[PDB]
């Protein structure tokens, strides 16, 4: 039987003398019953004392803890469900665990982290694991720059062998008080080191970061981190849900997020600003936040099976805003985009700026009666910006009673759709026998007063303006037009879309929209100019018919036939 | 030294009196050696006894277990490999574990769950973890409606912070005896609550559900659950592998399945019936089951890198059947579709109904000599239904010795391919010096007797029916025709496919099929009317020519150029 | 209180006699403090002793270890941080663990595996888990054929119930000394069994395999294994990073890799040679290695959100080489392709052979000034081989100052682009008034001397050779030409690309490249013949202008407009 000691204090005070003897510590703190274990006496060891796994008695004799498996924080005097600052004990336990390439467990309970000293996790040596349940790390009184950083101390080995073997952080709810200047998690390094830090294959999993300034911020050497079941919400910074600043060194390779939830920012968002940066999000959700991309160049974001939505929010914030730079690519593959009603969606929820690319694959474009994107764009479409959009396997909501809209200018079926030619070329104008009829291009005459429009004022007989383009099945389509009836003696006309085969035979599937009699700029086509491309179609023809005696302006004649583009 | 007690019974019987004293329980059950630990005496505590972590001695004094890490079921008297019902002890241990936001471990062994009382896991509080190995939960004698449900007790906090921190279920083989009315796992809530249940980020991993009525069924509040390495097999219900019923409240956001296996249903299948429901399957396999989607609208299922196959099965069941509703989308991206031989595949293995969409990306369409889809469709193609099919990066098996077939009517190269115009518009008819030979549209004369056909009976000189459409390289093509020869002297004629340049000159790569001399409706083109689109092609031409003395009906001239 | 014994030896030596008595083993090895636990005396057990969980005392009485949870290797006398061969104790502990369907833990430490006896993990019964941290399994002195194999003992059940419930291997750095004939991990069976082995749902996670002959090799029954955070590097075999040999039985269903890193092979690579084999790589990276696919038929590899790159390498090795077979499909969806500078990239980094297919989706094609692919291909393009390439949502680096290049021959905008017709068909020749100007096809006259070229030698007035093809928005393009000026009186001419709508109206977005005056074969178009397709474009026209008095050969006029119409 091994001699027994009821507390770490009693273990240290006893004049141990039997080299090699095993002794039992019953508890670190007297009367608690946690943090005990077996220790081997070594009278000759000169190992450094740490009051946890290497204990120096008052006579200098060492007691060396026998550990099997992970180090536990209570071995260093940490206590569960305590008001005392636990960060010193966790930091000391972590320093030791890292020194022997062993993970650190924190027993499930609540903890408070106070002070201002970050814990720097070295993923090549040891992770910190809340074990096991809903481990709560209250950092509301912490005043340092970052609570945790994760960054390797090695430039190559053994990081290339070890980072992947265990997570760097697991099982922790880490939260602040939205104090300015206190970030939650730094992924990588604050400043550029003299050598690189080999961080690839480091995992953060089953953690929540909440109520920091930036909850999660990428630093230098942020490459091939993976995140599983990570939640980030309710940060202070406009960029606080997840921030990738510009100018990072040795960063950007396949930052990966599996089933992560980025949400309820209450003004905080995701912003990717670093060039040459590649991120992959699988089955993630982006809720009540915007995903900004303003990298100078070469950002590639791939969202596979993700959701973008606004649950319970009246905000007109965008979902994805690729706003600057060139050669930036954003993929939405599968998943969903959900647009619950709000007082009026007055800007595009997706935006892709010049020289950038937004790709939609296998996803349904939503529609809602509250859509009012023309307030921003001048016309009724889902996506803004002068970049490029592609579609593959995209579904339109062709049976939505409120309507459907085209997705983007870059998918325009018809040439000179916005009268950007500065004339009516590409359009066939047929005034018929109306010699007094007038059809004219007008500059600064569209909805904004800054764009071209086509004015049609027929006399005696109606005027038809039309255009034909090649089309093929399979496909689905939606068109919107901006129309301003100045005067009309009745229904002012109709916009129609029809299909022909190669032989010129008219096919089923034609649709039309009456213009009515209401004056002023209005959207025509929402629940009328839409449908499926009929099998056998080889041409699509748009016709704008204006009746005799009417005076109507047309702008932004935007049809999209969605197919693989 | 801490005083020691050899059993929970002895711990409770002792007249504890020293407030604050630590004592050691050696074992819950006498002589077993499981479930012991340190306890702290509290003479003043009024905590409720649970015979596990809060023990009330016979004199009223409390003993409070010191726990570090998860709660274990043996702390409440559960025993491994016992014939006694373990569900009460696990349920009591779980109630406590959940009350202190701590997961519950069940030591690896076999357990019997009897009775009829489900365990309701609250993923915002605590999961149940089989630790660690092949933990066997025998529910063959359980008679309740569900074994496990998983549903948060919170509408927002702390669920928004906690659901993701640990799994709800891990490491368990949970099985029944296929008793009607006994389901395995309920994902969410049976009925609509007064407020919502915040379930997002809840995980089920490394579990098998087997031999229930419905193995896995979604309830209300089924949103952002994730499943990893979950197996579901051999259920009783036609919908028993995975069932998402219609009409769920607060459900449908990104239900996610990673490397899950849905298989060997022996009559049970997957069915998604809820509208506005979005599911993602990554490297899953669907084996010897059908994936049905009949949501009224707005289902989106994305299968990335999955396999659909029929290993060891003679069944002609479909693989994917999007059978009703509108605005339903099913994506197959990468992965594989495997069609082992059976006595005859008499219906299409993929089906997409009107107003729905089936997208194929980066996957190879298989072919097998046992394919007989015409028995359903009237004609030889891989996919059924009046919906829309798209392809991107799809490969055809052009060098499959048994043949190749077109994929879908919605990809038809040619106009009026099925004589659905009600006339021969879009088709060029040339008998040359056409006098006494017969070429006629016949209604209700095709393979099923309900569709149009074209009859040709030459006496004079042969007839050519032709059509040209634009095409571009690169591409792969396959055509099937339905042909009915009544009589002919020798070879009855040929169907040919040729390619032209922009100016109309013929290119290499043309193919043809002899009609032969067998009578009755037959498929022409399987291993003949297929190939790669030749370099320089800008037009594709189909030509049907019939010889003197033959009398032949033609129907369903279906070419697909994929790429 | 339970009687206590200080070592396994002392436990065995004692004359136990009281059936049912619980006794405490303090340590397996005297004085260490590891491997102890409670044992129950059993006078009725006739179980075979294993010196771990079933102990036979010197009088024959059995002592049955009370275990809760996994078996631990130290229960069988394994020791941490020891230079004794630990493989026998681990193997004995594993044999027992599998026999009771319980996983085996190895306490985190370093271990040496010597000898030549593999451990055959049965995933239907038990995994081996390094617990928990950077567990180091030194196999440098092991001389057997494989260190670990993973293969089920069952043909159906309970493998169909059990394989998925726990990993087969977790948390281990397993390494050799690059000895020929010693592989690290065999996935499945070495030879075909008479019955199948049901391996689906078996996981290997958080392991590194390093410095073996083949680090990871697929055997028979290799189906529905999943790998998470697995590293494979620095193998000896040319195929040693990951090898899937031809001829495997019962194999190929959805072999799945999540966030795995395949890298730094120093001559070792990935090779997929088995037919009817389907692999999925999600957020993996392939670094300083080639991914070879030479399956006879029906390989399907899907890479979602992966990176292919050459960090720190001067090697001109390919990234992906689909080199043989037919009906092989390789998908690159999202992620990145990175081509750091080297002395000159003289072959294509992607190659797809005849009858195979390489699909690019939502990824940016890189460009670098060191690109010299024409040394292999004859012309300046990114991808080699006579197979097919498709694009969907692909971005070109249109603003890269060094240039941009077309991707592949199969995406050629223009017909007879390589003069492979053996004539000048599809090209429109306009000599103007200069009738004696020479425009001719020349065989074996291109850059390699084995391909056709077009010689243009105008007299008096310049000659224009042109071609028009259909195009549509959305799109972007890059063209390269091989040009050989023999003689010229000045700037030899220019190549230009312009866009028209369906009605023949000219659009913005035209580009041109001067030929200059330097003689000899050169690439024209790198930073000139590129751009975005204008909205409303329905035709693209290339024109090659050669001035009077110039004598120029043209070859390989390769434009790619992505997506190709
Ligand atoms: C305004 C609007 O956009 O309406 C859409 C619905 O239109 C309906 O047609 C009517 C028109 O709106 C009316 O204006 C009028 O129009 C008539 C014209 O049609 C006619 O031509 O001319 C008439 C004049 O003479 C004119 O009056 O009447 C029509 C007919 O009534 C329907 O089309 C309806 O479809 C539904 O019903 C039809 C049918 O019975 O005919 C069925 O076929 C459909 O299956 C059925 O859906 C339209 O509803 C949308 O339908 C889409 C498919 O076409 C579907 O994709 C879409 O659902 C998506 O969007 C909703 C809202 O964003 C999502 O719902 C959310 O889901 C979340 C979970 O993911 C959940 O958390 C959300 O709850 C939160 O938010 C809600 C909320 O209000 O949004 C709150 O209530 C909660 O408190 C909060 O927690 C929410 O449920 C869904 O997931 C997504 O798929 C349908 O909206
Ligand atoms: C030669 C080369 O390819 O240059 C490309 C850059 O061209 C620049 O233009 C200049 C030309 O090169 C010059 O030739 C000349 O050209 C003139 C013409 O412009 C004019 O019209 O005609 C003249 C004829 O008379 C002609 O002389 O001058 C021009 C102008 O200066 C720029 O275009 C440059 O872009 C950058 O600057 C522009 C700008 O300010 O105008 C910005 O708009 C861009 O945003 C900015 O990038 C070109 O650089 C590339 O730009 C691409 C976008 O267009 C971008 O995608 C690409 O980056 C990719 O490739 C690099 C290299 O592979 C990747 O970088 C690596 O990233 C790794 C992590 O993923 C990292 O680990 C690597 O580091 C390791 O390896 C490196 C190494 O490179 O070997 C080692 O050094 C490290 O130690 C090691 O750790 C590496 O950083 C990047 O990730 C990927 O996205 C840009 O290279
Ligand atoms: O094939 C060769 O020529 C040589 O290949 C190996 O050489 C090793 C290789 O250069 C290794 O590169 C490291 C980087 O140093 C490290 O920064 C990290 O690089 C990533 C990069 O993959 C990605 O694109 O961008 C991220 C930043 O976003 C960047 O961090 O990992 C790679 C791969 O491990 O460095 C070691 C040490 O210098 C080299 O040894 C073979 O080992 C050589 O033998 C071989 O000659
Ligand atoms: O930006 C704003 O306007 C406000 O944003 C936050 O508000 C919180 C947000 O409304 C939160 O919504 C919860 C839902 O209550 C919950 O049902 C769940 O919603 C999912 C939904 O994402 C998906 O589309 O469909 C599933 C069902 O399939 C549905 O369950 O999650 C979301 C996100 O957490 O509710 C809380 C509590 O009411 C709101 O506070 C900010 O918190 C506000 O400050 C901000 O003003
Ligand atoms: O629906 C039916 O007709 C019958 O379905 C079940 O029958 C079971 C099924 O045939 C099961 O197949 C096993 C294979 O034996 C096994 O090799 C493995 O197959 C995979 C295959 O999915 C994939 O394509 O290729 C890999 C190799 O790369 C291959 O290993 O798994 C499947 C699915 O579990 O075998 C059992 C035992 O013979 C059958 O019982 C029902 O159980 C029957 O009741 C039903 O009649």
Residue numbers in the entry:
A (entry chain A), C (entry chain C): 15 to 579
B (entry chain B): 15 to 577
From the paper:
The sugar-bound crystals were subsequently obtained by soaking the E323A crystals in the crystallization solution added with the hydrolyzed K2 CPS products for 18–24 h. The complex structure was solved at 1.58 Å resolution. Interestingly, the sugar binding changed the space group of the crystals from P21 to C2, resulting in a single trimer of the enzyme in the asymmetric unit. The product-bound structure revealed three equivalent intersubunit carbohydrate-binding grooves in a trimer; two were bound with a dodecasaccharide, while the third had only one tetrasaccharide. Surprisingly, adjacent to the residues Ala323 (mutated from Glu323) and Glu267* that served as a boundary, the bound dodecasaccharide was, indeed, divided into a tetrasaccharide and an octasaccharide, which corresponded to the one and two tetrasaccharide repeating units identified in the hydrolyzed products of K2 CPS. This finding strongly supports Glu267 and Glu323 to be the catalytic residues, which allows for the numbering of the polysaccharide chain from −3 to +6 based on the direction from the non-reducing end to the reducing end. Notably, the C6-carboxyl group at the branched glucuronic acid that connects to −3 Manp formed a salt bridge with the residue Arg331 and a hydrogen bond to Ser327, suggesting a crucial role of this carboxyl group in the K2 CPS recognition by the enzyme. The distance between Glu323WT and Glu267* is ~4.9 Å, in good agreement with the typical distance between the catalytic nucleophile and general acid/base in a retaining glycosidase, i.e., 4.5–5.5 Å (35).
Here, we describe a phage tailspike protein, named K2-2, that specifically depolymerizes the K2 capsular polysaccharide (CPS) of K. pneumoniae into tetrasaccharide repeating units. During the initial stage of infection, the tailspike proteins (TSPs) of bacteriophage recognize specific polysaccharides on the surface of the host cell and attach to them for adsorption. TSPs, also known as polysaccharide depolymerases, have the function of binding and digesting CPS.
